[PDB]
Write a protein that binds this ligand. Structure first.
Ligand SMILES: *[C@@H]1O[C@H](CO)[C@@H](O[C@@H]2O[C@H](CO)[C@@H](O[C@@H]3O[C@H](CO)[C@@H](O)[C@H](O[C@H]4O[C@H](CO)[C@@H](O)[C@H](O)[C@@H]4O[C@@H]4O[C@H](CO)[C@@H](O)[C@H](O)[C@H]4NC(C)=O)[C@@H]3O)[C@H](O)[C@H]2NC(C)=O)[C@H](O)[C@H]1NC(C)=O
Ligand SMILES: *[C@@H]1O[C@H](CO)[C@@H](O[C@@H]2O[C@H](CO)[C@@H](O[C@@H]3O[C@H](CO)[C@@H](O)[C@H](O[C@H]4O[C@H](CO)[C@@H](O)[C@H](O)[C@@H]4O)[C@@H]3O)[C@H](O)[C@H]2NC(C)=O)[C@H](O)[C@H]1NC(C)=O
Ligand SMILES: *[C@@H]1O[C@H](CO)[C@@H](O[C@@H]2O[C@H](CO)[C@@H](O[C@@H]3O[C@H](CO)[C@@H](O)[C@H](O)[C@@H]3O)[C@H](O)[C@H]2NC(C)=O)[C@H](O)[C@H]1NC(C)=O
Ligand SMILES: *[C@@H]1O[C@H](CO)[C@@H](O[C@@H]2O[C@H](CO)[C@@H](O)[C@H](O)[C@H]2NC(C)=O)[C@H](O)[C@H]1NC(C)=O
Ligand SMILES: *[C@@H]1O[C@H](CO)[C@@H](O[C@@H]2O[C@H](CO)[C@@H](O)[C@H](O)[C@H]2NC(C)=O)[C@H](O)[C@H]1NC(C)=O
Ligand SMILES: *[C@@H]1O[C@H](CO)[C@@H](O)[C@H](O)[C@H]1NC(C)=O
Ligand SMILES: *[C@@H]1O[C@H](CO)[C@@H](O)[C@H](O)[C@H]1NC(C)=O
Length: 393
């Protein structure tokens, strides 16, 4: 039967859930701020966009121990990145990107205390710290030592000196999971239950919001059918998300189910309500306040070029051009096995920024959600393993 797919030792199904066959590609795109001065003086930001910077991923999920008479399994998804100079636009070490200096933006919200605002302000004046800063693509991505964080270490050592969009994340995991193997049913295959032992999320408001649904996102149960809707829990995005059925496609050799990410997921609605930390005050349709799970930094997740978000957002930054073709997030699954064939995962990263009279560095700047960069986590199935799947099916 089609019940050949479960996590059990040695089986072809489980086999590659350990080391997957697929050359997954992550591509970074940065927003270069071309009129930083005027941004401060109060104009509308003008950005240019540089990318792709393409890394190839190495995925191995280790630290495995089974349990509960064979119905559960625990591991960590481990992930690393290899830079390809040919398939990227330029060299991440050579090329420069001018953009927000987040450590200062962060230590500014990190100060909720009046004497802290006072003192932490003194720092920026004396150290000659500006709001907009120029770094190398490699630096922003991976790490650079900031003059400001360097100090905070000498005081409050728990805080790391370095900063990078991904810092200390090359070769590490997104945390320790436990997946329900497909024994108890074919439906609960590679579904998630306990993440760091947390059987629900702590930091949203409503229980619905806090809940953990669906797979890790690299796979689904067999018999995916046109009507039914799929749940996914990407870690870096901080919430449980779901996809809907679009249409029938053929990718490489196989039949496929096109699944996009529907609008009702990121909008202002009674269902999505509990994701607004200000007790029911929402930022708008199409963005997320991730500032809780990002350590308290002013971070806003969104879709590339604000796609699916209230036009009032696309309006705030000139140089934004969302189109469904480039900026959506689809996935193409095999309706029988629940295997992912053609998939492109695209989300953005923004810093919430507004004027502050206490801090001279923020100047007259507009109150807005300000984009730093976005990425495409893609994948494509080659010819060699297309036949092998056509075989097994
Ligand atoms: C990861 O995510 C990013 C997106 O965020 C992807 O990068 C994008 O890739 C797109 C294509 O995959 C690029 O889009 C192209 O942009 C060109 C101009 O910049 C434009 O000329 C292209 O338009 C053609 O393709 C369309 C189909 O997409 C057609 O409808 C259109 O008419 C053009 O197609 C040709 O048309 C002529 C007639 O005019 C025909 O004679 C040709 O035969 C047609 N050829 C084809 C193939 O149709 C297209 O819009 C986009 O620029 C790029 N953006 C960035 C920022 O990188 C990544 O690819 C994605 N995944 C991976 C794995 O990289
Ligand atoms: C993102 O935007 C930023 C800001 O606009 C941009 O940074 C700038 O990059 C240029 C090069 O592309 C840097 O210009 C250099 O500056 C040094 C002095 O600081 C000069 O010595 C250099 O002179 C050369 O210029 C010509 C070649 O470019 C030659 O004719 C000449 O003989 C020299 O070889 C050069 O002008 C500039 O310093 C930065 N600006 C800042 C503030 O860092 C960045 O390049 C953009 N990124 C992308 C990917 O487009
Ligand atoms: C995104 O979410 C963050 C939380 O992660 C929001 O920050 C929170 O803002 C509220 C104000 O609505 C703060 O509440 C008040 O703080 C003061 C000072 O401590 C206190 O005396 C009041 O009683 C009240 O609790 C709250 O402190 C703050 N939370 C954190 C963790 O900083 C933020 O406003 C959201 N961003 C946007 C753009 O909406
Ligand atoms: C992330 O770490 C990996 C693994 O350490 C790096 O990839 C490899 O390791 C060294 C790096 O100097 C070199 O042998 C090659 O670059 C890689 N070899 C193999 C076999 O993969 C990778 O460079 C790191 N990525 C970043 C952006 O730092
Ligand atoms: C997590 O999963 C549950 C069930 O899949 C989602 O709650 C369902 O929501 C729909 C529409 O909101 C209702 O028609 C169902 O009755 C609900 N079922 C249950 C069991 O609650 C919940 O929305 C999901 N949460 C997130 C954050 O995705
Ligand atoms: C697994 O799916 C079946 C199908 O409805 C359900 O009976 C069972 O409760 C699911 N597992 C858990 C832990 O709920
Ligand atoms: C979101 O919608 C609710 C009513 O559905 C409204 O009370 C709230 O103020 C809205 N928030 C925004 C940011 O539009």
């Amino acid at each position: 039967i089609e019940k050949k797919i479960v996590l059990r030792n040695g089986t072809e199904a489980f086999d590659s859930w350990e080391k997957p066959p697929l050359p997954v590609y992550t591509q970074f795109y940065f927003f270069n701020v071309t009129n930083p001065e005027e941004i401060l003086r109060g104009e509308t930001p003008r950005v240019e966009e540089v990318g792709p910077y393409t890394y190839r991923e190495l995925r191995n999920k280790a630290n495995i121990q089974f349990g509960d008479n064979g119905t559960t399994i625990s591991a960590v998804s481990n992930k690393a990145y290899v830079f390809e100079r040919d398939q990227s636009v330029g060299d991440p070490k050579i090329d420069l990107i001018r953009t927000l200096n987040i450590p200062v933006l962060t230590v500014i919200e990190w100060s909720q205390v009046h004497f802290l605002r006072e003192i932490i302000e003194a720092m920026l004046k004396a150290y000659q710290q500006k709001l907009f800063v120029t770094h190398t693509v490699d630096e922003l991505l991976w790490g650079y030592k900031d003059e400001i964080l360097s100090l905070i270490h000498v005081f409050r050592p728990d805080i790391s000196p370095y900063f990078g969009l991904f810092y200390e994340k090359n070769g590490t995991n997104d945390g320790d999971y436990v997946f329900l193997t497909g024994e108890d049913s074919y439906l609960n295959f590679t579904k998630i239950v306990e993440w760091n032992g947390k059987t629900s999320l702590d930091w949203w408001i409503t229980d619905k919001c806090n809940m953990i649904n669906g797979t890790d996102g690299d796979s689904f149960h067999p018999l995916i059918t046109k009507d039914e809707v799929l749940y996914v829990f990407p870690s870096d995005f901080c919430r449980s998300v779901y996809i809907t059925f679009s249409d029938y496609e053929s990718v490489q050799g196989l039949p496929a189910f096109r699944y996009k990410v529907p609008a009702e997921i990121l909008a202002n609605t009674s269902d999505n309500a509990g994701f607004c930390i200000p007790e029911g005050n929402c930022l708008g349709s199409g963005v997320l306040n991730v500032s809780i799970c990002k350590n308290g930094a002013p971070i806003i997740m969104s879709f590339p070029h604000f796609y699916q978000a209230d036009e009032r957002f696309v309006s705030a930054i000139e140089g934004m051009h969302p189109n469904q073709e480039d900026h959506e997030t689809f996935v193409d699954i095999n309706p029988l096995t629940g295997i992912i064939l053609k998939a492109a995962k695209r989300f953005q990263i923004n810093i919430y920024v507004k004027k502050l009279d206490d801090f001279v560095e923020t100047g007259d700047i507009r109150t807005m959600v300000f984009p730093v960069m976005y990425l495409n986590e893609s994948v494509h199935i080659d010819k060699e393993t297309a036949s092998r799947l056509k075989s097994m099916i």
